Structures are given as structure tokens and as C-alpha cells.
Amino acid sequence: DKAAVERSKMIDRNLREDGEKAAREVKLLLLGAGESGKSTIVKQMKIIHEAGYSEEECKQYKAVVYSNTIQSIIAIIRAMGRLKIDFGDAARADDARQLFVLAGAAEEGFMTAELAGVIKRLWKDSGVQACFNRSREYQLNDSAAYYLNDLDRIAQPNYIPTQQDVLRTRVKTTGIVETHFTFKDLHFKMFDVGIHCFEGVTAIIFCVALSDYDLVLAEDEEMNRMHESMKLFDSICNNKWFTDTSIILFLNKKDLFEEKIKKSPLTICYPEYAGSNTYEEAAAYIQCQFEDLNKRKDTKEIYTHFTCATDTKNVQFVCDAVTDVIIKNNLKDCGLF
Ligand SMILES: Nc1nc2c(ncn2[C@@H]2O[C@H](COP(=O)(O)OP(=O)(O)O)[C@@H](O)[C@H]2O)c(=O)[nH]1
Ligand SMILES: O=S([O-])[O-]
Ligand SMILES: [Cl-]
């Protein structure tokens, strides 16, 4: 372990009466465009380092799971009208009407056997599936298929959200969330911000949704999501405040990216791309595109990881590697408390 050797060279604890018990602090700034996976990484730190989610905690997310599911099916059904896609079975038109009747009369996310039946039959329909497969043409929750394929379980009367159900939720974050966890005897203070108050943070973790490459901003249908993310990364990576800050890049949603890359060409995002349309070549190209935005290459190193933030095991592996980089490079700028 090169990290253990490196940290063992520190002598600053000796200057403190109870130095060996002192807390070494690491501040991590968590950045990235909306829906890039920041809240999910936050949830994973709780799961991995601070004892997960109990069942009662999971229970609080029940109506969030229903809400996300309701939103997803409605977005697809509504898109069918705008894209002129017919139901595969004309009998589904009644189910579609009933979806709006049921969502329309409720105060918040909910589930009944009646609604489940409605959504289940809609989700199985060939025309709905065809609309689903053109989701790049509208705005659809990335977790749509996850919840809709598991609808039968979610619809059971004594349904209890699993940890993965909770990780899969999309929750509207406003403002700054700060989380604390201890790992490898470091006391991490993680800020979900998505900025001069964080000058001289130990490290930045910047999240990018790989699967955004063929999508558009909800605000401006003309604006390519990935180009927006690059511009944001450019504006962060080359900012005065962050020269001694380790810049970590999470190229996230690699699972979703791998699934669509065969069907939908990278050229939609990068017209000049002439590589093959495979997971390997297209992901590499995106990595190179982002790392290129760094204007101080022989000064600043970018530490890139491909992540699936909903996958606890991958996030645990990636977190472990990122932490070794910080221990090897940044401890001299981390204070004791
Ligand atoms: N399949 C998949 N879904 C993800 C991944 N990362 C995040 N999500 C989902 O994408 C949605 C948005 O992620 P979120 O953490 O809320 O993004 P934020 O706006 O940056 O906080 C949530 O529904 C997550 O469950 C991933 O790597 N793979
Ligand atoms: O001194 S180091 O081990 O935090
Ligand atoms: Cl999403």
C-alpha cells in the first residue's frame, strides 16, 4: 500500500497533545449538471460508510417511488400524442384515459391494484414500448424502466422499498446538502452544490451523465446536454480557486450508456466522431473530450472514473480508489481537528 506509506510520513499529529485521536478532515465538493448522479453518490456514502437504510427509512420513500413511476408512464403516454404513435391495441386508449383520471384525482403519489393494472397494461403495449424507445425525443426519468418492469412487486399491498428502490429515486434537490462520513480514518465533509466558499477544498468530484449524449435540456430543446456539461466542467477545471484541488471526474450512468450506445450514435453529440459505435470507443472518446478541457495539463491531472452511481459495489470500489489518491497527494493540505 503506497497510500499507507505516504500518510505514515506525516508528523503534524505530534504537535497536538492528543494528536493520535485528532480528526483529519477532507472537504469534497460535489459538482455536475442536474440528474448527473450527485444525490445518488450522497446516498451511497450513507449506505457504504454509515450503515445504510433501515426499513422505516426506506418506507419514507414509498410515495416517492410511486410518484416517479406515475411521472414516467405519463411522460411516455403524453409523448405518444406529440410523436403521433398509436397504441398497439386500441383498447389501451381507455387505460390511458384512466391513468389521467386516477393521477388527476390524487393529492400525491400512490398505488392501488386498479392503477397498477392500468400502468402494467400500458407498459406491455407495443406502441407504448416504441415510444419508450424514442425517449431521447422527450423528457423521461432514467429510472422509468427500472420501476415499470418491477411494477408487480412495487404494487403489492405491503410493499417495502429496497435500498436499490431508494437509490433509484429522483428527488428534487434545492440548495446545498452537506454530508459527513468517516472512511480510512479520514473525516469527509461532502457538499452537494452542483462556489467561492469552497476555494481550497481538498477535492472536487464532478459528475457527468454519459447517457445524456443524445438528449436535450428540458429548458431548451435545441441545447445538447453533454455540451452543457462540458462547458460547466471547463468553467470549473480551469478556475483559479482549484489549482491545488484534486479534480475527480465521475463519468456516470455507464450502465445506461452501454445499453443505448449500440442503438443511438455518438455523432448526435459529436458530429465529428468517426470511431465505432461501441461502448469501448465511444466512452473513451467522451473521456478524452472532457480531459481536453483542462488548460493546465502538465500542472493539473484529471482523475477519471467510469461509475454506475446506483451500484453500491461499483461506488464502493471507486470511492476506495479516489480516497487512495487523496491520501497519496493531498494530506498535507488537510487539517486536524
Ligand atoms: N441507471 C442509473 N441511474 C442512475 C445513475 N446515477 C444516477 N441515476 C439515477 O438518475 C436520477 C438522477 O440522479 P440524481 O442523483 O438525483 O442526480 P442529481 O440531480 O445530480 O442529484 C436518479 O433517479 C438516480 O437514481 C447510474 O449510474 N445509473
Ligand atoms: O496522519 S494521517 O494518518 O491522517
Ligand atoms: Cl433522470
From Swiss-Prot:
Physiological role: Guanine nucleotide-binding proteins (G proteins) function as transducers downstream of G protein-coupled receptors (GPCRs) in numerous signaling cascades. The alpha chain contains the guanine nucleotide binding site and alternates between an active, GTP-bound state and an inactive, GDP-bound state. Signaling by an activated GPCR promotes GDP release and GTP binding. The alpha subunit has a low GTPase activity that converts bound GTP to GDP, thereby terminating the signal. Both GDP release and GTP hydrolysis are modulated by numerous regulatory proteins.
Protein name per its UniProtKB record: Guanine nucleotide-binding protein G(i) subunit alpha-1
Subunit note: Heterotrimeric G proteins are composed of 3 units; alpha, beta and gamma. The alpha chain contains the guanine nucleotide binding site. Part of a spindle orientation complex at least composed of GNAI1, GPSM2 and NUMA1. Identified in complex with the beta subunit GNB1 and the gamma subunit GNG1. Identified in complex with the beta subunit GNB1 and the gamma subunit GNG2. Component of the TAS2R14-GNAI1 complex, consisting of TAS2R14, GNAI1, GNB1 and GNG2; within the complex interacts with TAS2R14; this complex plays a role in the perception of bitterness.
Effect of K328L: Mildly impairs receptor binding; mildly decreases basal and receptor-stimulated GDP exchange
Region of interest: G2 motif: 165-173
GO MF annotation: an example: adenylate cyclase regulator activity
Region of interest: G1 motif: 27-40
Residues annotated as binding GTP: 35-40, 142-143, 167-170, 192-194, 252-255, 309
Catalytic activity line of the entry: GTP + H2O = GDP + phosphate + H(+)
